[PDB]
């Protein structure tokens, strides 16, 4: 309810396997800033369970190391919408996908006012995908982003791009 791009007949069974977070953006810079900001987590594989709901497993700089961290997303009656437990519990939103290339997507808060908000292009190979790109830069001039960040393909390829 800042996001009000989903996807549209989202099989959430073709988002299964390996990802590259490609590029970042999110709402306030100090959730993207250092390699260990809050945020600031890169994706290696999505993992939809049989009953629907959606595992991701990502890299996030922790103690000065690269860790390896596994969340599960509650599927929701919406099926672009998943949510995350915490004090603050947390939406995630499928934007976009074509399955075989890219998938666009964002995590929100409940807040308020506090719009706070982080999205990633995803993508399926260490590629500079201009469409995929242009697509998210779309999603993201409807929302008020004020940290971008971008990968090359030598960083896709590091624990926590380098």
């Given at each position: 309810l800042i996001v009000t791009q989903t996807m549209k007949?989202?099989?959430?069974?073709?988002?299964?396997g390996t990802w590259y977070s490609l590029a970042m953006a999110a709402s306030d810079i100090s959730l993207l800033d250092?390699?260990?900001?809050?945020?600031r987590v890169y994706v290696e594989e999505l993992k939809p369970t049989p009953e629907g709901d959606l595992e991701i497993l990502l890299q996030k700089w922790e103690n000065g190391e690269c860790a390896q961290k596994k969340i599960i997303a509650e599927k929701t009656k919406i099926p672009a919408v998943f949510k995350i437990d915490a004090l603050n519990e947390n939406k995630v939103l499928?934007?976009?996908?074509?399955?075989?290339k890219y998938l666009l997507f964002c995590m929100e808060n409940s807040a308020e006012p506090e719009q706070s908000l982080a999205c990633q292009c995803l993508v399926r190979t260490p590629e500079v995908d201009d469409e995929a790109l242009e697509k998210f830069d779309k999603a993201l001039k409807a929302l008020p982003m004020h940290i971008r960040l971008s990968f090359n393909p030598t960083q896709l390829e590091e624990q926590c791009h380098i």
């Open positions: 007949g989202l099989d959430i069974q073709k988002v299964a250092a390699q260990s900001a809050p945020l499928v934007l976009d996908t074509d399955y075989k």
